[PDB]
Amino acid sequence: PIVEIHLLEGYSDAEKERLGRSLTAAVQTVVPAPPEAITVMMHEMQAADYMRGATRRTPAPALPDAAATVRDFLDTMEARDLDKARTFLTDDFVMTFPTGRRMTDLSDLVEWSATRYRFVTKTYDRFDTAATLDGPVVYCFGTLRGEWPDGTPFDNVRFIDRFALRDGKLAVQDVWNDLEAMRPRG
Amino acid sequence: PIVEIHLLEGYSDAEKERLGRSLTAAVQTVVPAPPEAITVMMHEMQAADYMRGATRRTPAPALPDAAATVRDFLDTMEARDLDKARTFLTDDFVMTFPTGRRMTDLSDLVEWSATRYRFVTKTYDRFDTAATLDGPVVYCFGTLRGEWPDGTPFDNVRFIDRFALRDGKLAVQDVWNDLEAMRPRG
Amino acid sequence: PIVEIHLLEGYSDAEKERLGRSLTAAVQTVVPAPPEAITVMMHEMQAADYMRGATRRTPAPALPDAAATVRDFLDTMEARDLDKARTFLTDDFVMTFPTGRRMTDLSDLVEWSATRYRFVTKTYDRFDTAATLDGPVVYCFGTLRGEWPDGTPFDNVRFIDRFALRDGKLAVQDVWNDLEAMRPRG
Amino acid sequence: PIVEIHLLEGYSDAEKERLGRSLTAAVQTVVPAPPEAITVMMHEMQAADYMRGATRRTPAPALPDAAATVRDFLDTMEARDLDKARTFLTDDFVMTFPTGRRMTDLSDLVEWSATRYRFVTKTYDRFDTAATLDGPVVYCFGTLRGEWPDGTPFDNVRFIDRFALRDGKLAVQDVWNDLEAMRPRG
Amino acid sequence: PIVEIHLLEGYSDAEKERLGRSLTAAVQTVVPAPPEAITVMMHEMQAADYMRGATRRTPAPALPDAAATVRDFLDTMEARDLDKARTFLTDDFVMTFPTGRRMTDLSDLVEWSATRYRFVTKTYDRFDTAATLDGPVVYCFGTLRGEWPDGTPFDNVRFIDRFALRDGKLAVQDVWNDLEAMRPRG
Amino acid sequence: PIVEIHLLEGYSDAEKERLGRSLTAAVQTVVPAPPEAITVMMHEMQAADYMRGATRRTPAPALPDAAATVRDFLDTMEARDLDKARTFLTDDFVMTFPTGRRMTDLSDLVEWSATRYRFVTKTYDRFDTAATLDGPVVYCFGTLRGEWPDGTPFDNVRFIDRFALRDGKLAVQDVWNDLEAMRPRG
């Protein structure tokens, strides 16, 4: 198939590359063509050349790459810089962790997790973005290395995180992992 | 923005609705417009009206809704009908469950899980589809109700599954959940 | 220039001819091309092939030719069939006649005009439609034949009417003419 | 609906705004959509990118806003600057005034109207442009203030003018008003 | 590259295949892409959906495949059916043969060639069509088998013909060949 | 008809003029419209605005005008500059001349033709280009002036050449002419 999209000028070459990959993948959820067979053409318009409601329109500035926002937030959390982490978040951000623990304060999380392990470090196997009609949703998964509270090291403990965004800011985090499954029981 | 897509005749009204929603969401990963502002127009062509390589082309039949394939497979598994379940799968299907247990045989899974709970039943909170350039990827999550092996009932145990597909068939399953986190320890 | 327009199926061949003439004339208010040089192409879409807001849309049924509505109302008024005339009108229809007389009741008009002439009959020289962003506006003009109240005949008395419409119904009438200019003064 | 128009480069942002409003209104004479629902996209082409008859074409320079030409001519006439007024006119310009008086010379008009009032000054309620296939046609109307020949002042006397243009110049004027209707009769 | 063409309904699937191959080859005279990379999409319009000069237009019926017309004429000439051959021709058809002999009458040709060989039979190596802006031009070439006037057989004598057409009928024929080069000289 | 073509930026105004004439003529092999009725519009895209296979693509640099390449080679051959002539040619270039003589070496040709005439000079009546799906093919024809080996002059001897190209270089030459037909026989 061939996809054309009409948009106002002002998007970067990198924003366009994202949009083009995104449209190409959307086609592949219905049409089992290889990416190589799918064309995306973008038609950029000056403000004077576009009109809706008999008025000119001003383009909404692009959203940031949601997957990179998510990675940057989780990197900031591993560096323990909470002041910076809170800048990625909506005022009503909610996280849910294993056991169903629901928290709204990043410091509540740190208290809670101290009892569960000394530290943990994420290795990422993959980021997937799920385009929805309420904006993008980010899934990332891979493995954890760390130490149980007695200093015993572990590695390779599967994890997965899900983030919902709102106007580029993180609004909901959900977390699932294999920690309780691999924890030693004496 | 306005999206046009050119495709050969032969897709159903329902396949088109999927493709149109999918393209609309793709736009929203970069352009923070509301769905209401985004138009998708589909231009359908008879075979005589399309030519690539100076030849007519024959359309690849649509892929099934991946999320519905996934739901149907997991429903079949809850009914214990393995013969039917295997028809959803590629010959090299691989599942990975908590602890990192890797299995290729649906009967291996049933043996293994019998030791972990009497039964479990999924309530779905959400299906998300992640369009990628290797085809769609399905994420679903919600909660489990069941009984521990001693007959003790539990409900509301968070879970998440991830499926990768290949030409409409399920090729990779990954599973993460809160069972070991909620299991009673005596 | 070349004009394309994308619309949902359901318009008649005659509604399309109106729309095509209308778009062709719009171009000529800025570009001094002859009609012969201007192309209009209409792209008709089945409901399954169009999507805004990730939903299908249902086309608003065409407006009637405003100039013909206006002619039909004025013909009905010349036949004195007020019951039928009132069906062309909005509930708040207002007419303004020479001297600035403002009336909302068709019977008020008949009372008033009886003192001004025995009868009058319109010959139309032209109908012009003014496309605006509040819908079409109709101008028609030509001459009147009739009799002054003493039975003296006149012909060829210039007149002009202006109508504003609202959802196909007549909402405002304004009238200007040469009657008082040609009336005999003894 | 969605309207695309293909045109050669060289039109101003203001000429485009006129053309876009004009096309938007044309749609509304048939399709009862609100302006807000109607999109106009203009595709501008360099000369090297357009070909008709296997040759490049040179764009006809835009027509001036006909309504503004008309206003400027009538303002010049109120200032009594006939030398400048004649520059707006075709060589065969014809005016028709109440009683059907037909004149081709602006000085003939001034002679004639001196007997009818001392002076008159237009207040404009509205300009409407009627796109036709012989070019734009301008209608304007509102009220007159002035003095009858005995110095008696009047205000609020309804008037309407109609202009036909030809290649940007005024070619036909028609006038209708309430003066004879409001003139005092002693 | 991607080529779209807009045309009125009424062309056959075979006329479209010709037009699509023809447009694909035109691209390849400038852009060194393989045919496989070049897409042609044809947009067919009902009469009600197309307008030029504010009127509907009626499509000119397709031209026949010029190469097949040429082959059919030359086959008819080999069968000696002149009555049928003349139906392929314009009233002013002109042929030019080796030595520059110019003839307008098919019977003149037969007289002339009788002195040159007993008979000759064409084997075609290729037909090429040259799209020009005065319509298509056909070139065909291959070899001749026959007998010199003394009954001596020859084969494999190179030839080439060129035809210019006019509204589907043959208007000019030019011929060049190796006969005089291979004729035996005693 | 109306033709649009979508291409990457980087073609000259002259390459576009060729492509536009070429597409216009292609239409005329099926649709008997005059060139004046046929529109070609070229849509040029920046690399950031085009994507196939979810990657940006780099345009293949234009082919040179094949007819001009052919003329330049034949002009170089008339000047006897073989070193320069060989630069127009593929490594496997093959020429076939009257009698079917097949040669791969430009010096072989010069030896052979010395026995046939003192010299010859081409006057061109026409170049035609035949767009095919293996690239352009060039036909040129007109007349020869020269001298037979005894110094006797001739003029006006019809000739025709055909060239097949490959990636802009000449790959096959075929030649047919009236020399043996006009040679004097004593």
From TrEMBL, chains A, B, C, D, E, F:
List residues of the SnoaL-like domain.
70-171
Q: One matching Pfam family, short form?
A: Tautomerase
Answer whether the UniProt record assigns the keyword Transport to this protein: no
Q: Does the keyword Isomerase apply?
A: yes
Domain annotation 4-oxalocrotonate tautomerase-like: ranges: 1-53
Which keywords does UniProt give here?
Answer: Isomerase
For this UniProt entry, the molecular function terms from Gene Ontology, in alphabetical order, are: isomerase activity
Q: What is this protein called?
A: Tautomerase
